[PDB]
Known about the structure:
Elements: E1 14-17, H1 31-34, H2 39-58, E2 67-68, E3 74-75, E4 80-87, E5 90-97, E6 101-110, H3 118-122, H4 125-132, H5 140-159, E7 168-173, E8 177-182, E9 196-204, E10 207-215
The structure holds magnesium ion (2 copies).
One magnesium ion is lined by residues 44, 86-87.
Keywords: Magnesium, Metal-binding, Transferase
Binding site for Mn(2+) 1: 44, 86
Binding site for CoA 2: 41, 49, 68, 71, 85-86, 149, 153, 163-164
Amino acid sequence: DQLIASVVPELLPSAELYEDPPGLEPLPEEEPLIAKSVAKRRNEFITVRYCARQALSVLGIPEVPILKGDKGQPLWPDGIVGSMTHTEGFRGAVVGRTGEVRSVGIDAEPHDVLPNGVLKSIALPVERDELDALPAGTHWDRLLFCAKETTYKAWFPLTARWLGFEDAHITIDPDGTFTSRILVDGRANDGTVLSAFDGRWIIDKGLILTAIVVPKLAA
Ligand SMILES: [Mg+2]
Ligand SMILES: [Mg+2]
């Protein structure tokens, strides 16, 4: 009953953990990336890459470092796309072949009200009214935050550009889907235009997991 696996296609292997297993190490090439980091950050960095290497192995890729670009993005092997996320009680990664999908993003958050002031900073005025109308029993504010994070993670590998909270309008459906409408220039690096993303969401184990897969276009 893994969360990521329940919201991405079977052809995108994923792996996740809810605690840091004892004894894990970064690969040698990864050590400089967390040398200056606090211990909590070291732990999540190491464990999420353990998960990513597990998923990569399913695609036939043996142990390899996963470094980071200047904008924080993970640097995947040739022919691979993927995404990672970590929060209190969750580390997760998903990967896929560029021959199968264009991009993927995921995000995890605890299923609770957003911290004070955060919803105001992330939500368009219309989004706030929309969330107020969704069915009781779900922290839709936190789900919106997650979906916004996921939208940027799926977007950046295809554009190499920023996407702020105000640059996409996210509509959440109670049925476990959402849509992200892009409000900025959507020209992508493959010549196409990105105007909207389709996403999926699940709440389980006290956590929200959101995911966007950007499909390949028809030939
Ligand atoms: Mg994190
Ligand atoms: Mg996040």
